[PDB]
Amino acid sequence: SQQTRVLQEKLRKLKEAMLCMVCCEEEINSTFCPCGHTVCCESCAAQLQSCPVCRSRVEHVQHVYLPTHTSLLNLTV
Amino acid sequence: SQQTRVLQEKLRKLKEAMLCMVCCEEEINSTFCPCGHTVCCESCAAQLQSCPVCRSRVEHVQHVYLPTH
Numbered sequence A: 001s002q003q004t005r006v007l008q009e010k011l012r013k014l015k016e017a018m019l020c021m022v023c024c025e026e027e028i029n030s031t032f033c034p035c036g037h038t039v040c041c042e043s044c045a046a047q048l049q050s051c052p053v054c055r056s057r058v059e060h061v062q063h064v065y066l067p068t069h070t071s072l073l074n075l076t077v
Numbered sequence B: 001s002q003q004t005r006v007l008q009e010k011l012r013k014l015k016e017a018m019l020c021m022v023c024c025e026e027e028i029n030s031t032f033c034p035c036g037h038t039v040c041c042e043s044c045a046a047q048l049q050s051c052p053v054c055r056s057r058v059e060h061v062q063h064v065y066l067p068t069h
């Protein structure tokens, strides 16, 4: 029905919000410190000297383990 | 349809995974450092000496700003 399409759209937007804002291909799993913006995968976070959201200098990157993380292992057998 | 029910289930599970593992009422927005487990809201995280997932000592709590917030 039309509600199936509406729910498909909400699910797609929620999943897109969980992907790296720079490469758009990998899940977010890194925090820029000290600002706290958590918007990149580990590969894009390592290459940025300043935060892409607030422009604060990145002192270091903290890896984050989130309950929403998925990997190829989560595939349905 | 049945497909609508399946999508509603996936959305509900994704939203429940974003909630604090201790109070179950507030969104996760804090990381235990240095282990990196990001499983609590600020209020529950502030009171813990050790990570509730891996038992590593918490040296400090980093507030996180996620696009899903």
Ligand SMILES: CCCC(=O)Nc1nnn(CC)n1
Pocket (backbone or CB within 6 Å): A017, A018, A019, A027, A028, A029, A066, A067, A068, A069, A070, B017, B018, B019, B027, B028, B029, B066, B067, B068, B069
């Ligand atoms: C309140 C917690 C929301 C959350 O976990 N968001 C999120 N954003 N990107 N990811 C990567 C899977 N996960």
Ligand SMILES: [Zn+2]
Pocket (backbone or CB within 6 Å): A020, A021, A022, A023, A024, A025, A026, A040, A041, A042, A043, A044, A045
């Ligand atoms: Zn990336």
Ligand SMILES: [Zn+2]
Pocket (backbone or CB within 6 Å): A032, A035, A036, A037, A051, A052, A053, A054, A055, A056
């Ligand atoms: Zn920032």
Ligand SMILES: [Zn+2]
Pocket (backbone or CB within 6 Å): B020, B021, B022, B023, B024, B025, B026, B040, B041, B042, B043, B044, B045
């Ligand atoms: Zn809590």
Ligand SMILES: [Zn+2]
Pocket (backbone or CB within 6 Å): B032, B035, B036, B037, B051, B052, B053, B054, B055, B056
């Ligand atoms: Zn931990």
